[PDB]
């Protein structure tokens, strides 16, 4: 019953709508929900030179890429939450349903 749905996404409002959708689906299917626990955002940071040559003033580019991680833990037999999580998928987020 104790099953772990984690959502890893680069875009935030996408992830938030998926987090909302799984709470909606859970409270409708009448099963105990642990709310969307927000793990710290990881900021992948790469900083390079701008110029292809080396005949300019030393200006650097600061490239960032945030990656967000939510998880909701439910008390439900595999099936009903599997069919809840088989609907309403968008390209931004990525799903993991963990049983044990």
């Amino acid at each position: 019953h104790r099953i772990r749905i984690t959502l890893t996404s680069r875009n935030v409002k996408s992830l938030e709508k998926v987090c909302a959708d799984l709470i909606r689906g859970a409270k409708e299917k009448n099963l105990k929900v642990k709310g969307p626990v927000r793990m710290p955002t990881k900021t992948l940071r790469i900083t390079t030179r701008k110029t292809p040559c080396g005949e300019g003033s030393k200006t650097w580019d600061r490239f960032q890429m945030r990656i967000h991680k939510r998880l909701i833990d439910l008390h439900s037999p595999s099936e009903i939450v599997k069919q809840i999580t088989s609907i309403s998928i968008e390209p931004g987020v990525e799903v993991e349903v963990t049983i044990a």
């Binding site: 890893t8 680069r10 990881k42 992948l44 890429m65 990656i67 991680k69």
Partner: peptide, 19 residues
């Protein structure tokens, strides 16, 4: 997936894939 790589490397892998 037993290769079980980091979410950091997973997303830059998906980044170069589309690129």
């Amino acid at each position: 997936m037993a290769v079980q790589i980091s979410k950091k490397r997973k997303f830059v892998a998906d980044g170069i894939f589309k690129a």
